[PDB]
Design an enzyme around this catalytic site. Structure first.
Site, PDB file in Angstrom:
ATOM      1  N   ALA A 243       6.563  12.641 -16.913  1.00 60.25           N
ATOM      2  CA  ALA A 243       7.034  11.376 -16.349  1.00 60.25           C
ATOM      3  C   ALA A 243       8.559  11.265 -16.404  1.00 60.25           C
ATOM      4  O   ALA A 243       9.133  10.968 -17.454  1.00 60.25           O
ATOM      5  CB  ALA A 243       6.380  10.187 -17.063  1.00 60.25           C
ATOM      6  N   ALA A 244       9.206  11.508 -15.269  1.00 59.81           N
ATOM      7  CA  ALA A 244      10.658  11.423 -15.174  1.00 59.81           C
ATOM      8  C   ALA A 244      11.045  10.517 -14.012  1.00 59.81           C
ATOM      9  O   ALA A 244      12.223  10.305 -13.728  1.00 59.81           O
ATOM     10  CB  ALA A 244      11.254  12.808 -14.993  1.00 59.81           C
TER      11      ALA A 244
ATOM     12  N   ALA B 166      15.173   2.920  -7.795  1.00 58.64           N
ATOM     13  CA  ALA B 166      14.265   2.255  -6.863  1.00 58.64           C
ATOM     14  C   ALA B 166      12.969   1.785  -7.531  1.00 58.64           C
ATOM     15  O   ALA B 166      12.541   0.635  -7.333  1.00 58.64           O
ATOM     16  CB  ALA B 166      13.974   3.163  -5.680  1.00 58.64           C
TER      17      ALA B 166
ATOM     18  N   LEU C  91       2.767 -19.840 -16.398  1.00 63.46           N
ATOM     19  CA  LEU C  91       2.456 -20.978 -15.536  1.00 63.46           C
ATOM     20  C   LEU C  91       1.284 -21.858 -16.014  1.00 63.46           C
ATOM     21  O   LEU C  91       0.384 -21.387 -16.715  1.00 63.46           O
ATOM     22  CB  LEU C  91       2.177 -20.462 -14.122  1.00 63.46           C
TER      23      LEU C  91
ATOM     24  N   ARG D 210      -4.329 -17.656 -11.845  1.00 64.96           N
ATOM     25  CA  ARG D 210      -3.503 -16.759 -12.668  1.00 64.96           C
ATOM     26  C   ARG D 210      -3.803 -15.280 -12.348  1.00 64.96           C
ATOM     27  O   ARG D 210      -2.900 -14.475 -12.040  1.00 64.96           O
ATOM     28  CB  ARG D 210      -3.741 -17.069 -14.146  1.00 64.96           C
TER      29      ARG D 210
ATOM     30  N   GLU E 279       2.993   0.989  -3.819  1.00 66.09           N
ATOM     31  CA  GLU E 279       4.269   1.703  -3.852  1.00 66.09           C
ATOM     32  C   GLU E 279       4.157   3.065  -4.568  1.00 66.09           C
ATOM     33  O   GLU E 279       4.753   4.057  -4.126  1.00 66.09           O
ATOM     34  CB  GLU E 279       5.380   0.853  -4.488  1.00 66.09           C
TER      35      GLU E 279
ATOM     36  N   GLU F  37       4.857  10.722  -0.156  1.00 65.74           N
ATOM     37  CA  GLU F  37       6.189  11.201   0.146  1.00 65.74           C
ATOM     38  C   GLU F  37       6.507  12.493  -0.637  1.00 65.74           C
ATOM     39  O   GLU F  37       7.132  13.439  -0.112  1.00 65.74           O
ATOM     40  CB  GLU F  37       7.222  10.112  -0.150  1.00 65.74           C
TER      41      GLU F  37
ATOM     42  N   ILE G 264       0.507 -19.740  -0.987  1.00 66.56           N
ATOM     43  CA  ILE G 264      -0.703 -20.541  -0.899  1.00 66.56           C
ATOM     44  C   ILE G 264      -1.108 -21.113  -2.246  1.00 66.56           C
ATOM     45  O   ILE G 264      -1.472 -22.287  -2.361  1.00 66.56           O
ATOM     46  CB  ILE G 264      -1.863 -19.720  -0.308  1.00 66.56           C
TER      47      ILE G 264
HETATM   48  C1  LIG Z   1      -1.186  -5.973 -25.840  1.00 68.33           C
HETATM   49  C2  LIG Z   1      -1.453  -6.862 -24.648  1.00 68.33           C
HETATM   50  C3  LIG Z   1      -2.194  -8.128 -25.012  1.00 68.33           C
HETATM   51  C4  LIG Z   1      -2.676  -8.942 -23.822  1.00 68.33           C
HETATM   52  C5  LIG Z   1      -3.598  -8.181 -22.875  1.00 68.33           C
HETATM   53  C6  LIG Z   1      -4.570  -9.068 -22.112  1.00 68.33           C
HETATM   54  C7  LIG Z   1      -3.947 -10.372 -21.646  1.00 68.33           C
HETATM   55  C8  LIG Z   1      -4.040 -10.567 -20.178  1.00 68.33           C
HETATM   56  C9  LIG Z   1      -3.242 -11.317 -19.454  1.00 68.33           C
HETATM   57  C10 LIG Z   1      -2.107 -12.112 -19.974  1.00 68.33           C
HETATM   58  C11 LIG Z   1      -2.224 -13.546 -19.543  1.00 68.33           C
HETATM   59  C12 LIG Z   1      -1.444 -14.485 -20.412  1.00 68.33           C
HETATM   60  C13 LIG Z   1      -1.475 -15.928 -19.937  1.00 68.33           C
HETATM   61  C14 LIG Z   1      -2.350 -16.835 -20.782  1.00 68.33           C
HETATM   62  C15 LIG Z   1      -3.815 -16.635 -20.555  1.00 68.33           C
HETATM   63  O1  LIG Z   1      -4.371 -15.577 -20.507  1.00 68.33           O
HETATM   64  O2  LIG Z   1      -4.438 -17.798 -20.405  1.00 68.33           O
HETATM   65  C16 LIG Z   1      -5.841 -17.735 -20.074  1.00 68.33           C
HETATM   66  C17 LIG Z   1      -6.174 -18.975 -19.288  1.00 68.33           C
HETATM   67  O3  LIG Z   1      -5.738 -20.111 -20.045  1.00 68.33           O
HETATM   68  C18 LIG Z   1      -7.651 -19.073 -18.989  1.00 68.33           C
HETATM   69  O4  LIG Z   1      -8.411 -18.464 -20.027  1.00 68.33           O
HETATM   70  C1  LIG Z   2      -0.513 -19.170  11.429  1.00 66.23           C
HETATM   71  C2  LIG Z   2      -1.688 -18.590  10.665  1.00 66.23           C
HETATM   72  C3  LIG Z   2      -1.757 -17.083  10.759  1.00 66.23           C
HETATM   73  C4  LIG Z   2      -0.512 -16.374  10.250  1.00 66.23           C
HETATM   74  C5  LIG Z   2      -0.225 -16.613   8.782  1.00 66.23           C
HETATM   75  C6  LIG Z   2      -1.371 -16.239   7.869  1.00 66.23           C
HETATM   76  C7  LIG Z   2      -1.033 -16.351   6.403  1.00 66.23           C
HETATM   77  C8  LIG Z   2      -0.374 -17.656   6.152  1.00 66.23           C
HETATM   78  C9  LIG Z   2      -0.978 -18.807   6.002  1.00 66.23           C
HETATM   79  C10 LIG Z   2      -2.449 -19.041   6.023  1.00 66.23           C
HETATM   80  C11 LIG Z   2      -2.784 -20.062   4.968  1.00 66.23           C
HETATM   81  C12 LIG Z   2      -1.909 -21.281   5.072  1.00 66.23           C
HETATM   82  C13 LIG Z   2      -2.280 -22.183   6.224  1.00 66.23           C
HETATM   83  C14 LIG Z   2      -2.252 -23.655   5.851  1.00 66.23           C
HETATM   84  C15 LIG Z   2      -3.292 -24.025   4.835  1.00 66.23           C
HETATM   85  O1  LIG Z   2      -3.695 -23.309   3.960  1.00 66.23           O
HETATM   86  O2  LIG Z   2      -3.729 -25.268   5.030  1.00 66.23           O
HETATM   87  C16 LIG Z   2      -4.790 -25.722   4.163  1.00 66.23           C
HETATM   88  C17 LIG Z   2      -5.368 -27.021   4.668  1.00 66.23           C
HETATM   89  O3  LIG Z   2      -5.191 -28.004   3.644  1.00 66.23           O
HETATM   90  C18 LIG Z   2      -6.831 -26.912   5.034  1.00 66.23           C
HETATM   91  O4  LIG Z   2      -7.035 -25.998   6.110  1.00 66.23           O
HETATM   92  C1  LIG Z   3       9.055 -16.579  -8.264  1.00 65.46           C
HETATM   93  C2  LIG Z   3       8.537 -15.379  -7.471  1.00 65.46           C
HETATM   94  C3  LIG Z   3       8.003 -15.738  -6.075  1.00 65.46           C
HETATM   95  C4  LIG Z   3       7.479 -14.553  -5.249  1.00 65.46           C
HETATM   96  C5  LIG Z   3       6.259 -13.879  -5.838  1.00 65.46           C
HETATM   97  C6  LIG Z   3       5.720 -12.717  -5.025  1.00 65.46           C
HETATM   98  C7  LIG Z   3       6.657 -11.515  -4.947  1.00 65.46           C
HETATM   99  C8  LIG Z   3       5.992 -10.316  -4.346  1.00 65.46           C
HETATM  100  C9  LIG Z   3       6.376  -9.059  -4.474  1.00 65.46           C
HETATM  101  C10 LIG Z   3       7.556  -8.563  -5.241  1.00 65.46           C
HETATM  102  C11 LIG Z   3       7.663  -7.037  -5.282  1.00 65.46           C
HETATM  103  C12 LIG Z   3       8.915  -6.490  -4.618  1.00 65.46           C
HETATM  104  C13 LIG Z   3       9.342  -5.133  -5.150  1.00 65.46           C
HETATM  105  C14 LIG Z   3      10.710  -4.689  -4.641  1.00 65.46           C
HETATM  106  C15 LIG Z   3      10.638  -3.870  -3.386  1.00 65.46           C
HETATM  107  O1  LIG Z   3       9.684  -3.808  -2.658  1.00 65.46           O
HETATM  108  O2  LIG Z   3      11.780  -3.203  -3.176  1.00 65.46           O
HETATM  109  C16 LIG Z   3      11.893  -2.452  -1.943  1.00 65.46           C
HETATM  110  C17 LIG Z   3      12.402  -1.047  -2.173  1.00 65.46           C
HETATM  111  O3  LIG Z   3      13.511  -1.054  -3.081  1.00 65.46           O
HETATM  112  C18 LIG Z   3      12.771  -0.348  -0.885  1.00 65.46           C
HETATM  113  O4  LIG Z   3      12.979   1.047  -1.082  1.00 65.46           O
HETATM  114  C1  LIG Z   4       8.091 -18.915   7.128  1.00 66.61           C
HETATM  115  C2  LIG Z   4       6.658 -18.618   7.535  1.00 66.61           C
HETATM  116  C3  LIG Z   4       5.810 -17.995   6.424  1.00 66.61           C
HETATM  117  C4  LIG Z   4       5.747 -18.819   5.140  1.00 66.61           C
HETATM  118  C5  LIG Z   4       4.910 -18.195   4.027  1.00 66.61           C
HETATM  119  C6  LIG Z   4       3.406 -18.171   4.298  1.00 66.61           C
HETATM  120  C7  LIG Z   4       2.772 -19.557   4.439  1.00 66.61           C
HETATM  121  C8  LIG Z   4       1.515 -19.729   3.634  1.00 66.61           C
HETATM  122  C9  LIG Z   4       1.028 -20.860   3.140  1.00 66.61           C
HETATM  123  C10 LIG Z   4       1.617 -22.231   3.275  1.00 66.61           C
HETATM  124  C11 LIG Z   4       1.074 -23.234   2.264  1.00 66.61           C
HETATM  125  C12 LIG Z   4      -0.295 -23.798   2.551  1.00 66.61           C
HETATM  126  C13 LIG Z   4      -0.274 -25.082   3.360  1.00 66.61           C
HETATM  127  C14 LIG Z   4       0.248 -26.284   2.585  1.00 66.61           C
HETATM  128  C15 LIG Z   4      -0.681 -26.759   1.505  1.00 66.61           C
HETATM  129  O1  LIG Z   4      -1.098 -26.080   0.607  1.00 66.61           O
HETATM  130  O2  LIG Z   4      -0.977 -28.056   1.659  1.00 66.61           O
HETATM  131  C16 LIG Z   4      -1.740 -28.704   0.613  1.00 66.61           C
HETATM  132  C17 LIG Z   4      -3.224 -28.436   0.718  1.00 66.61           C
HETATM  133  O3  LIG Z   4      -3.545 -27.682   1.895  1.00 66.61           O
HETATM  134  C18 LIG Z   4      -4.053 -29.699   0.652  1.00 66.61           C
HETATM  135  O4  LIG Z   4      -5.430 -29.396   0.466  1.00 66.61           O
END
Ligand SMILES: CCCCCCC/C=C\CCCCCC(=O)OC[C@H](O)CO
Ligand SMILES: CCCCCCC/C=C\CCCCCC(=O)OC[C@H](O)CO
Ligand SMILES: CCCCCCC/C=C\CCCCCC(=O)OC[C@H](O)CO
Ligand SMILES: CCCCCCC/C=C\CCCCCC(=O)OC[C@H](O)CO
Ligand SMILES: CCCCCCC/C=C\CCCCCC(=O)OC[C@H](O)CO
Ligand SMILES: CCCCCCC/C=C\CCCCCC(=O)OC[C@H](O)CO
Ligand SMILES: CCCCCCC/C=C\CCCCCC(=O)OC[C@H](O)CO
Ligand SMILES: CCCCCCC/C=C\CCCCCC(=O)OC[C@H](O)CO
Lengths: 99, 115, 93
Positions: free
Chosen positions: A1-2, A8, A26, A33, A47, A54, A92
């Protein structure tokens, strides 16, 4: 593992790790979660697989062949779809948590 | 710094475009995924369900693309009737099918609980 | 006997998930995580098969490919464990 030392994987991996920590802190229910943690880890997985492909392409050699470019491009597209999946997932699930 | 992002974007788009241009089955798949995403987007379900319906079909797409990547490496080498060429494609295809069966099942479970 | 034990693992997991008194969403997550592990293992095996198709002689990029593949599998496994711990802690909480 290097491979872990390369900048990147450093960037991508650190992003994923951060997201996993934030999701661990959260105030959300369990299924949310798990979804938040899984989408980002799937981005890491994809990735890694892309980079594996690659590595094989480059193993074959330097001479360009269309199918080499194609393999790499398809790999990238996979990564892109995963990222978009992560972003839709977080948007979402946390629009709901927007308070 | 963000030129990696632009470069990667461009490769990705070239990849989607190649997949789409080259096979009807890929196009028909892409339609099914887009329809599923739209349907998921408009359905009266909770947020987690919506995400499961979306993620399952997205996953189908991700594995279809990785598997195609592998097929292209195989075909690159020659595919000249080799044991491991066969094997590599067989494993890749198994992966694709598992993804698809899981998506279908996930949709059926979720929409059974829903209606 | 390296590919069957995984089918054993998935069947067992499925049996547990069915056996556990959880709702559909939880069940979908429990089984999906396991399923992703399988898909990633199959893709890793695909890469390995190609790597060996080229040649069994060592080359740094071959080792690199196998390492990256195995790391993918590892991440999927970790994600599965995290999913199970979380959902089951929630169910039994
Ligand atoms: C040496 C690693 C020890 C932890 C490994 C397993 C833990 C898995 C995921 C970490 C999630 C931590 C967030 C808190 C959490 O799990 O809350 C559980 C929810 O409240 C629902 O049960
Ligand atoms: C324009 C939809 C197709 C392209 C985007 C797909 C992935 C993004 C969003 C889909 C889920 C968000 C849509 C809005 C949403 O969830 O509304 C929930 C409403 O409360 C009930 O339908
Ligand atoms: C408060 C966080 C809100 C957004 C949560 C979802 C984020 C989802 C994915 C993050 C992973 C991105 C990894 C970086 C990445 O793809 O880099 C691109 C390469 O460096 C290109 O060679
Ligand atoms: C800039 C376009 C792409 C933006 C990211 C993807 C959009 C995906 C989801 C949007 C959020 C879902 C709709 C809003 C929402 O959750 O409303 C509240 C509930 O639907 C009420 O039940
Ligand atoms: C919210 C977004 C959800 C996206 C789901 C996955 C979509 C997957 C694949 C569709 C790829 C579309 C490519 C279209 C394409 O290549 O068109 C090329 C035309 O022939 C010329 O423009
Ligand atoms: C009323 C229920 C169904 C609602 C359908 C909404 C839209 C669903 C799918 C749209 C797919 C459109 C084609 C996308 C695509 O890749 O196009 C390729 C380019 O146009 C190149 O020819
Ligand atoms: C309940 C649907 C949710 C899961 C969607 C999984 C999508 C996976 C693969 C799509 C299968 C192909 C679509 C149909 C198709 O190719 O039709 C073409 C015509 O039948 C012949 O040209
Ligand atoms: C090949 C990929 C998919 C593998 C899983 C196939 C289906 C197997 C198990 C899913 C759950 C089926 C049983 C449902 C169940 O346990 O219902 C609970 C009972 O109603 C008691 O509350």
């Amino acid at each position: 593992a290097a491979w872990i030392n390369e900048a990147a994987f450093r960037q991508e991996g650190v992003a994923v790790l951060l997201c996993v920590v934030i999701a661990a802190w959260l105030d959300v229910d369990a299924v949310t979660r798990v979804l938040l943690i899984s989408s980002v880890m799937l981005v890491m997985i994809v990735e890694l697989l892309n980079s594996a492909i690659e590595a094989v392409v480059d193993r074959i050699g330097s001479e360009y062949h269309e199918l080499s470019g194609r393999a790499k491009d398809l790999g990238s597209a996979a990564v892109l779809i995963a990222i978009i999946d992560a972003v839709i997932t977080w948007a979402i699930l946390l629009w709901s948590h927007f308070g």
